[PDB]
Write a protein that binds this ligand. Structure first.
Ligand SMILES: Nc1ncnc2c1ncn2[C@@H]1O[C@H](COP(=O)(O)OP(=O)(O)OP(O)(O)=S)[C@@H](O)[C@H]1O
Ligand SMILES: [Mg+2]
Lengths: 364, 132
């Protein structure tokens, strides 16, 4: 079916071959790495960008192009090694991972570091240029900063023949997280990926759905515009498109439903579906807050206000245990803030949502 | 002139209530400004007190106490049609904006300018606008 084909095309893992939306950045990286590969000299580049900008996809596509060029005997052969920071149980274990990727030897963290140091500092046998990719750099931080210093200092050696690309989300990292000597080592080589404009998002969506007339232009334009105005991320755009397809299986209404179901908060409807006693408790809290003006109140005054409200409403007199159970249930779903493990009558209560939202939910 | 005098006295008393260091503006202040207006009317030799006397009295009292774009208009016009609805018909907004004295070209320009900020989205059929 057409909807099934659109769902298949719009999946996240269905990476395209090459989209010129980032062709400029691709070209810049293609010049830099090509220069580092032609001169038999190492280098380092730091790239910072918000998630969803295609950093990993762009790097992998550049690696694919470089490997294809090497296969066409135009570039000297190179060894590619990829490591992910968040896929490692311990920080020091990255030394074992790289060593096992290059020689397959098993050694301790310190011994693996020493062997890697010996290989990268001593004039050994002439090896292929090493392309090292490290993902999620900020998660390799250590109070001693030895791992980061070694990672960004080793390619400085002529014998290293190592090119390192660091992908991260924060551009401030080399300034406030990295010390001076290594900050100057990554200085002036910082690539920032700006978020896609709504035109770029529309171009990407059109490329996803070439030769397929399944969505109207209006839904596509609105989805790209919401994405631009909220995060400018292709991942949530694909999720919205898939949800719109699912709802259409059941127009602009589908996209609106997707965006206001996957982004909007459910606090209002949760309060609406609350019980009568919980509503009375919330009203008592609001009345006590208006009387006092403070954002913290003990359980005793709230209980007194609840008893007064119940007397006004004609409800039966509530026991302390019942009110405590209701409060504990409310705190379980993170609508309030309380520590009722030991304190019972002296519990500080803070609202987890804005007062105006509570008023707008309770007026109806 | 009584209504204007009442409004001016309310404004002055509200200002004196907002400022703690201002003198207590009881009914004696109203009596004083009325006396000033009557004195001015006597000075100008007229049997009826005019608003110029009231303005001069207010000015004198204030001096004495002192010694001690089409885009926005069109956005507001279409904002007036948000009485409980998220989507607004194109024809109704177009008719209302033209009735205010704006050409359709300026209406389209304002729609595009506030549309760039993505405050809302317009259907390509130019029949309905869903406000983001
Ligand atoms: N050039 C491109 N044009 C359009 N969409 C792209 C492009 N490159 C990547 N994408 C899409 O955007 C998604 C995000 O790509 P990633 O590289 O995984 O994100 P990232 O920028 O690396 O950020 P994280 O936090 O590391 S996932 C990809 O899974 C693709 O679906
Ligand atoms: Mg990534």
């Amino acid at each position: 079916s057409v909807l099934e084909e659109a769902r298949l095309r719009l999946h996240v893992s269905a990476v395209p071959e090459s989209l010129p939306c980032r062709e400029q950045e691709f070209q810049d990286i293609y010049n830099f790495v090509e220069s580092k590969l032609l001169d038999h000299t190492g280098g380092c580049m730091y790239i910072s960008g918000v998630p969803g900008t295609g950093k990993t996809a762009t790097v992998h596509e550049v690696i694919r192009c470089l490997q294809q060029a090497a296969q066409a005997n135009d570039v000297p052969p190179f060894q590619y090694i990829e490591v992910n920071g968040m896929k490692l149980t311990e920080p020091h274990q990255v030394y074992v991972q790289i060593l096992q990727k290059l020689t397959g030897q098993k050694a301790t963290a310190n011994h693996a570091a020493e062997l890697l140091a010996k290989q990268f500092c001593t004039r050994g046998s002439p090896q292929e240029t090493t392309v090292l990719l490290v993902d999620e750099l900020d998660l390799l931080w250590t109070h001693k900063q030895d791992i980061m210093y070694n990672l960004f200092d080793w390619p400085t050696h002529k014998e290293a023949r190592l090119v390192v690309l660091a992908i991260a989300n924060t551009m401030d990292l080399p300034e406030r997280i990295m010390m001076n000597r290594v900050s100057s080592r990554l200085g002036l080589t910082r690539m920032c990926f700006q978020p896609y404009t709504y035109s770029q998002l529309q171009q990407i969506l059109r490329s996803r759905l070439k030769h397929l007339k399944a969505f109207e232009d209006d839904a596509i334009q609105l989805v790209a515009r919401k994405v631009a105005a909220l995060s400018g991320d292709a991942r949530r755009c694909l999720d919205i498109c898939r949800r719109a397809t699912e709802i259409c299986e059941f127009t602009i209404a589908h996209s609106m439903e997707a965006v206001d179901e996957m982004f909007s908060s459910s606090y209002i409807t949760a309060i609406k579906n609350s019980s009568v006693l919980e509503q009375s408790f919330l009203r008592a809290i609001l009345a006590e807050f208006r009387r006092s003006g403070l954002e913290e109140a003990t359980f005793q005054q709230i209980y007194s206000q609840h008893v007064a409200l119940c007397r006004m409403e004609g409800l039966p007199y509530p026991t302390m245990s019942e009110t405590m159970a209701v409060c504990s249930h409310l705190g379980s779903c993170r609508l309030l803030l309380v520590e009722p493990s030991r304190n019972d009558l002296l519990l500080r209560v803070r609202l987890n949502v804005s007062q105006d939202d509570v008023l707008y939910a309770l007026k109806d | 002139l009584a209504d204007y005098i009442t409004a001016a006295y309310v404004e002055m008393r509200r200002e004196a209530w907002a400022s703690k260091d201002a003198t207590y503006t009881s009914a004696r202040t109203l009596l004083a400004i009325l006396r000033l207006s009557t004195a001015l009317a006597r000075l100008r030799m007229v049997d009826v007190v005019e608003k110029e006397d009231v303005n001069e009295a207010i000015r004198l009292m204030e001096m004495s106490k002192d010694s001690l774009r089409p885009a926005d208009v069109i956005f507001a016009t279409v904002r007036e049609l948000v009485s409980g609805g998220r989507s607004v018909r194109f024809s109704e907004a177009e008719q209302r904006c033209v009735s205010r004295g704006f050409t359709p070209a300026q209406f389209q320009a304002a729609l595009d300018e506030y549309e760039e900020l993505n405050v809302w989205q317009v259907n390509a059929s130019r029949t309905r606008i869903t406000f983001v």
